[PDB]
Amino acid sequence: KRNEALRIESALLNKIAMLGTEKTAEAVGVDKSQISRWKRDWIPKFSMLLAVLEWGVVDDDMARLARQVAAILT
DNA sequence: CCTCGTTGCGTTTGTTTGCACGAACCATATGTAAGTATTTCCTTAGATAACAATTGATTGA
Incomplete structure (x- = not known):
């Protein structure tokens, strides 16, 4: 659960960074x-x-890989 | 000499920090007890020598 916690924290922080601290605050309230x-x-x-x-x-990243594979096969 | 790559400066967009401000949750300070109830213990061991002060008996006047 330790490494899963680290992974989840990294993913959350990446999502906030991509959306934007200002924009994330504006949307959250x-x-x-x-x-x-x-x-x-x-x-x-x-x-x-x-x-x-x-x-x-x-x-x-693996999500993008799966999308690309699903596009290439289909 | 003109022209193009590097730097000084300001601008725009975006993010973390420093104060001040409720809010709430626990920490502190304080008060109130209405059968009667009434003067304390406890501790500690086998020194020894020297020196003054103090208190008590003996004696010169």
Whole structure:
């Protein structure tokens, strides 16, 4: 669960970074500072919970690989 | 000499930090007990020598 927690934290932080701390705050309903500080404080803890809760999702690179394979075959 | 690559500067977009501000949850401080109830213990071992101070008896006047 340790490495799953690390993976989930990395995926979450990547999603926030891609969407944008400012944009993520605007969509969530908080201030950019709140997202910036959740990234430091709770995202690791929530990530460990997800690792235990077994909510891990497919890594996006392998997702792109699967999409490409499904396009090439079909 | 003109022209093109490198740097100084400002601009735009985006992110983390420093204060101040509720909110809530626990930590502290304080108060209130209405059968009667009434003067404490406990500890500790086999030194020895020297020196003053203090207190008590003896004696010169």
